[PDB]
Amino acid sequence: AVQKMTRVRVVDNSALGSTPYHRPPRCIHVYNKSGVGKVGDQILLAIRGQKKKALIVGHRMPGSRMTPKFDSNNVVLIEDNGNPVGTRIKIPIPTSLRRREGEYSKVLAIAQNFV
Amino acid sequence: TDYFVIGSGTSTRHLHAMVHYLVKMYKHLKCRSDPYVKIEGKDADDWLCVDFGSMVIHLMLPETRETYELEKLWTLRSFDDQLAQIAAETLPEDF
Amino acid sequence: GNQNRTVYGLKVWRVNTKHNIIYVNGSVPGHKNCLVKIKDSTLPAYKDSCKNLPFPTYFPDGDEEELPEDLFDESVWQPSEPSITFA
Amino acid sequence: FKTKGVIKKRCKDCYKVKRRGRWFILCKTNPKHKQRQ
Amino acid sequence: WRECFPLQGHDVARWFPGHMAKGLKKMQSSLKSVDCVIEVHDARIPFSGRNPLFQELLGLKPHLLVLNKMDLADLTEQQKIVQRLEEKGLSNVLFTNCVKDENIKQIVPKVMELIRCSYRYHRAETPEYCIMVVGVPNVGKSSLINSLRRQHLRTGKAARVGGEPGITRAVTSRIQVCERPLVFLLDTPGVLAPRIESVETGLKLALCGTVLDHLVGEETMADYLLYTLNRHGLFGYVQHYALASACDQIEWVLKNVAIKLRKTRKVKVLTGTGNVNVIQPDYAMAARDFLRTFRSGLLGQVMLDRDIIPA
RNA sequence: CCUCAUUGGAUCAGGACAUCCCAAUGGUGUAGAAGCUAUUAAUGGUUCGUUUGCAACGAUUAAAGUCCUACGUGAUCUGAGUUCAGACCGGAGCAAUCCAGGUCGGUUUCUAUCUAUUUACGAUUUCUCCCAGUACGAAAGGACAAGAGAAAUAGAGCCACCUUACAAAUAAGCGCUCUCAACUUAAUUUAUGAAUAAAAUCUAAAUAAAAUAUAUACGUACACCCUCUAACCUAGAGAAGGUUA
RNA sequence: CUCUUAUCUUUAAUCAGUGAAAUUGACCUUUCAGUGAAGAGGCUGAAAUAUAAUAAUAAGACGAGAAGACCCUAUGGAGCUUA
Numbered sequence: 001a002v003q004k005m006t007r008v009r010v011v012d013n014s015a016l017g018s019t020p021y022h023r024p025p026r027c028i029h030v031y032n033k034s035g036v037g038k039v040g041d042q043i044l045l046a047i048r049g050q051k052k053k054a055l056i057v058g059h060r061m062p063g064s065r066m067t068p069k070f071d072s073n074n075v076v077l078i079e080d081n082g083n084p085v086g087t088r089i090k091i092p093i094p095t096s097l098r099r100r101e102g103e104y105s106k107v108l109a110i111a112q113n114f115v
Numbered sequence: 116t117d118y119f120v121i122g123s124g125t126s127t128r129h130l131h132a133m134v135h136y137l138v139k140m141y142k143h144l145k146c147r148s149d150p151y152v153k154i155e156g157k158d159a160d161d162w163l164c165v166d167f168g169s170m171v172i173h174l175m176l177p178e179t180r181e182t183y184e185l186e187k188l189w190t191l192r193s194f195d196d197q198l199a200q201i202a203a204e205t206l207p208e209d210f
Numbered sequence: 211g212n213q214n215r216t217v218y219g220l221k222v223w224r225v226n227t228k229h230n231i232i233y234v235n236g237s238v239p240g241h242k243n244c245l246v247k248i249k250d251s252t253l254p255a256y257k258d259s260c261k262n263l264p265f266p267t268y269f270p271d272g273d274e275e276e277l278p279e280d281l282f283d284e285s286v287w288q289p290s291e292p293s294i295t296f297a
Numbered sequence: 298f299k300t301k302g303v304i305k306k307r308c309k310d311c312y313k314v315k316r317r318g319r320w321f322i323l324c325k326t327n328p329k330h331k332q333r334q
Numbered sequence: 335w336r337e338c339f340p341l342q343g344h345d346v347a348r349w350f351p352g353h354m355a356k357g358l359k360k361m362q363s364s365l366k367s368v369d370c371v372i373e374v375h376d377a378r379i380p381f382s383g384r385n386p387l388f389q390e391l392l393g394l395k396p397h398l399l400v401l402n403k404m405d406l407a408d409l410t411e412q413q414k415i416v417q418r419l420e421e422k423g424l425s426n427v428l429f430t431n432c433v434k435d436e437n438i439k440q441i442v443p444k445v446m447e448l449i450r451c452s453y454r455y456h457r458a459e460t461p462e463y464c465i466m467v468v469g470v471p472n473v474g475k476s477s478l479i480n481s482l483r484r485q486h487l488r489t490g491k492a493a494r495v496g497g498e499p500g501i502t503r504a505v506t507s508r509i510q511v512c513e514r515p516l517v518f519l520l521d522t523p524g525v526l527a528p529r530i531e532s533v534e535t536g537l538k539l540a541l542c543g544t545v546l547d548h549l550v551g552e553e554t555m556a557d558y559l560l561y562t563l564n565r566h567g568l569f570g571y572v573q574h575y576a577l578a579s580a581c582d583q584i585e586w587v588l589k590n591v592a593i594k595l596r597k598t599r600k601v602k603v604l605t606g607t608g609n610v611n612v613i614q615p616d617y618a619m620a621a622r623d624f625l626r627t628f629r630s631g632l633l634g635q636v637m638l639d640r641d642i643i644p645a
Numbered sequence: 646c647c648u649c650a651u652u653g654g655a656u657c658a659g660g661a662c663a664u665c666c667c668a669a670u671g672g673u674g675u676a677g678a679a680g681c682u683a684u685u686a687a688u689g690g691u692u693c694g695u696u697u698g699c700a701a702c703g704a705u706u707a708a709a710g711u712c713c714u715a716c717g718u719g720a721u722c723u724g725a726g727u728u729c730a731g732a733c734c735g736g737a738g739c740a741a742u743c744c745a746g747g748u749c750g751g752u753u754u755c756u757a758u759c760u761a762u763u764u765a766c767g768a769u770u771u772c773u774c775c776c777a778g779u780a781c782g783a784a785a786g787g788a789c790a791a792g793a794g795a796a797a798u799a800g801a802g803c804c805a806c807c808u809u810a811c812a813a814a815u816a817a818g819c820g821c822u823c824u825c826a827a828c829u830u831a832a833u834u835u836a837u838g839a840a841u842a843a844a845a846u847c848u849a850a851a852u853a854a855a856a857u858a859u860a861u862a863c864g865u866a867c868a869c870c871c872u873c874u875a876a877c878c879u880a881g882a883g884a885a886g887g888u889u890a
Numbered sequence: 891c892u893c894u895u896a897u898c899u900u901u902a903a904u905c906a907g908u909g910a911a912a913u914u915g916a917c918c919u920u921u922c923a924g925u926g927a928a929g930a931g932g933c934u935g936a937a938a939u940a941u942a943a944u945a946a947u948a949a950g951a952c953g954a955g956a957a958g959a960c961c962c963u964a965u966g967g968a969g970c971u972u973a
């Protein structure tokens with residue numbers, strides 16, 4: 001579960017996240033009628049003075065049986081037009097993203113490992 | 116997916132036409148029992164992706180194809196040049 | 211608590227004729243070992259669905275045909291069946 | 298249909314009726330001419 | 335070395351507290367008894383900040399601009415600054431250093447001469463010349479009261495002078511400044527603007543200390559120093575902080591500054607196996623000290639608005 | 646010659662309609678899509694933050710309505726202010742003191758006697774898919790109804806799993822399930838037809854229909870006259886209620 | 891805090907013993923609209939209505955208390971200062 005003011009780990013190779021900076025990114029908005037964010041839910045980060053959209057690809061909170069619980073809250077940065085900012089994702093991504101209602105094929109293409 | 120398809124397009128207009136034609140043919144060409152397919156990336160202006168049941172097609176402009184290099188990743192599963200640059204780390208104290 | 215409440219539109223997934231057990235989707239008001247009232251659903255959709263069911267009641271004394279011990283709904287995956295492979 | 302306090306005809310084709318407890322001027326040629334009291 | 339500071343996606347600097355609103359009402363009500371209005375400002379920023387409302391709301395009375403903090407600024411092209419300020423319609427402009435009472439004598443004669451040209455109407459019979467000082471926070475506005483309080487009356491400090499913005503809250507009573515012309519001053523709280531113009535002006539307006547630094551983070555601002563400091567050529571931080579050699583990356587310089595000052599934190603980082611608390615050098619503390627040295631003038635004289643003044 | 650002093654929040658909300666969204670319609674300088682204007686309707690809903698002392702912005706939403714209830718509501722709670730005992734600056738006064746000028750500090754308690762009140766219901770909204778990138782339109786762009794599927798919230802429940810506890814046989818949510826019918830109308834639109842020679846006219850003429858939100862006609866729930874030494878109970882403050890080869 | 895939850899102790903509640911306090915014109919002590927001074931259980935007109943307890947809530951009885959606040963009055967005081 002991601003909320004407002006949560007601390008997030010960018011799991012791309014994009015410069016926006018990749019570059020080591022003393023502050024992690026923090027969530028400013030969750031794009032849902034429910035304030036909570038789960039796998040496949042977009043969020044608006046505040047990353048290095050910039051406001052950037054992102055997608056949740058994993059979280060530490062338990063989900064339904066047969067789905068993977070991660071140890072960190074993982075997020076990918078997406079451009080305003082919706083194209084991913086980064087070109088590669090080396091961390092495993094759950095396969096549930098494929099069937100959730102939304103646009104996730106672009107992210108899946110960039111992800112080599114699926115869990 | 117069983118098959119991964121990437122095809123370049125001349126311009127944004129051409130990209131929309133190709134996507135619309137394929138979906139129109141897809142519905143006409145049987146698939147009566149099979150469910151429907153969404154068109155993804157319409158908000159995007161240069162990259163459109165349509166995911167059929169067992170095939171995924173990505174249509175994008177030449178520059179977008181060059182930047183993302185989808186062909187290399189799937190051809191070279193773990194030996195992609197961009198992937199190689201992504202290493203791992205740990206967190207030790209500073210002294 | 212301790213009030214009469216009703217749940218509407220619960221599907222019947224399976225019936226066990228030997229032990230007279232009914233499998234009803236979801237939750238039922240009351241504690242375990244609590245007596246409940248079971249009757250056909252009064253929701254608009256299933257207005258006249260009792261055409262197929264035994265109209266007066268099910269008579270086992272009639273013995274027109276002997277029922278299988280377990281009755282299932284078609285969507286149900288029965289145990290002892292091959293493992294589901296969504297081929 | 299504008300609800301106005303005074304109903305006045307605005308063209309030759311406009312005609313008057315007493316429907317559902319109220320006075321109407323209804324014009325087939327120009328629907329702009331419709332008024333209710 | 336970088337080329338242009340990235341300003342895409344950053345937001346504007348909105349501070350505008352409530353006291354800067356209740357204050358603006360009192361200032362309007364005080365027009366009754368003000369012969370002239372004095373705008374104080376930071377010499378380092380000739381053409382930015384500059385709350386437009388002061389000319390708009392307080393335009394009724396005659397105006398005089400007093401660029402303060404001239405000591406910690408580069409005024410080689412002062413002649414040029416006047417030429418353009420003449421184009422802006424600010425015929426009379428003064429540069430003054432409050433702390434070391436530089437050029438503060440000249441202000442009163444100009445205010446006298448400036449008032450002579452104007453009309454006084456209802457106050458034409460009053461013998462006391464009351465004028466009013468306004469400006470953005472931390473421009474020396476309250477200090478100017480004291481510098482004139484002593485230079486002429488030779489009495490002593492009368493207004494609370496403080497480093498951080500927001501010290502003076504409400505429009506106060508008159509403070510006597512001189513006896514021979516019998517000049518009184520009305521001190522008012524610093525107002526910035528309801529809406530700063532550009533992300534850069536707002537970034538510059540924080541450099542001199544006009545707006546609370548935590549509203550900008552102090553990390554999107556330390557970077558700006560390194561850019562302009564290197565761009566303008568003032569390679570003084572290397573010697574002061576005994577850095578190896580010139581650089582244009584905050585993570586590097588703030589790494590060096592932090593080690594020099596022997597400052598470290600225990601910061602929670604989020605790795606792939608779970609949150610871990612790791613001791614790390616204080617990037618935040620270095621940014622403050624790097625900012626607090628600049629503002630103290632030990633890093634050199636600067637002309638933040640350059641190539642905007644020449645033109 | 647100058648002047649100047651109750652109201653926020655929290656909790657729970659009752660109501661008006663002069664309607665912010667949802668719903669039904671008239672007109673258009675309404676091609677479609679976006680809009681504008683007016684009628685009808687009170688149905689349920691009407692977000693989270695930052696600086697703030699009144700505003701000033703950020704990100705959202707179908708929408709973030711306008712008002713009345715003695716700031717609706719302090720014997721439910723809370724921040725200001727009124728506003729004092731201490732203390733400073735600025736300005737007065739010979740002083741004591743003073744200022745509708747700044748600032749920092751700073752104790753209201755209550756066991757409820759009376760009235761009133763404390764044991765069911767029949768759902769709202771949004772997005773995607775389809776029709777269909779079609780109708781329309783020079784292009785740009787781009788619908789309606791009909792039909793299927795997802796969630797969010799609310800209401801009512803439950804514990805097989807998951808999670809958190811009791812390092813108990815349980816309780817919780819962060820887990821799971823279920824939610825529907827409209828006889829009765831308003832704006833508006835049709836059909837038949839007199840006053841009124843029409844091959845007119847929807848009708849405060851006699852007539853026939855369609856058409857928001859409401860609601861209870863129509864349903865579900867309840868329904869038994871009930872032994873009690875005592876024990877036990879997923880029933881409970883007591884009493885009541887259930888159970889007893 | 892989102893967004894509350896579980897456990898234990900205190901209190902509560904039931905049984906036994908002992909036993910106060912502010913308060914109290916009389917009460918057989920209802921709802922709505924009206925009237926009225928911002929005002930009604932008690933007045934006008936409708937309506938509702940077997941009788942008594944026990945445990946809860948605090949809308950009301952402009953609920954109860956304290957030497958609380960605010961303005962004005964007295965040919966009532968007192969402290970302080972002076973020109």
Ligand SMILES: Nc1nc2c(ncn2[C@@H]2O[C@H](COP(=O)(O)OP(=O)(O)NP(=O)(O)O)[C@@H](O)[C@H]2O)c(=O)[nH]1
Nearest residue numbers: 432471472473474475476477497499500501502524
């Ligand atoms: N170096 C230098 N510092 C100065 C000068 N004038 C004022 N300062 C510094 O500025 C601060 C005082 O600001 P102040 O005089 O109160 O100005 P203000 O604008 O009235 N303050 P505010 O932000 O409350 O509106 C102190 O840190 C003081 O040392 C100057 O001429 N030179």
Ligand SMILES: [Mg+2]
Nearest residue numbers: 657658659660
């Ligand atoms: Mg309400």
Ligand SMILES: [Mg+2]
Nearest residue numbers: 662664685686
């Ligand atoms: Mg209305």
Ligand SMILES: [Mg+2]
Nearest residue numbers: 718719720949
């Ligand atoms: Mg009260």
Ligand SMILES: [Mg+2]
Nearest residue numbers: 720755757948
């Ligand atoms: Mg009480």
Ligand SMILES: [Mg+2]
Nearest residue numbers: 730731732742
């Ligand atoms: Mg004293």
Ligand SMILES: [Mg+2]
Nearest residue numbers: 748749750751
């Ligand atoms: Mg205080």
Ligand SMILES: [Mg+2]
Nearest residue numbers: 731749750751
């Ligand atoms: Mg204290």
Ligand SMILES: [Mg+2]
Nearest residue numbers: 728749750751
């Ligand atoms: Mg105080």
Ligand SMILES: [Mg+2]
Nearest residue numbers: 757945946947
């Ligand atoms: Mg009671």
Ligand SMILES: [Mg+2]
Nearest residue numbers: 776790791792
């Ligand atoms: Mg449709």
Ligand SMILES: [Mg+2]
Nearest residue numbers: 905906907908
């Ligand atoms: Mg006793």
Ligand SMILES: [Mg+2]
Nearest residue numbers: 918919920939
């Ligand atoms: Mg009685």
Ligand SMILES: [Mg+2]
Nearest residue numbers: 922923924930
């Ligand atoms: Mg009354």
Ligand SMILES: [Mg+2]
Nearest residue numbers: 933934935936
């Ligand atoms: Mg009566």
Ligand SMILES: [Mg+2]
Nearest residue numbers: 883903944945
């Ligand atoms: Mg008792």
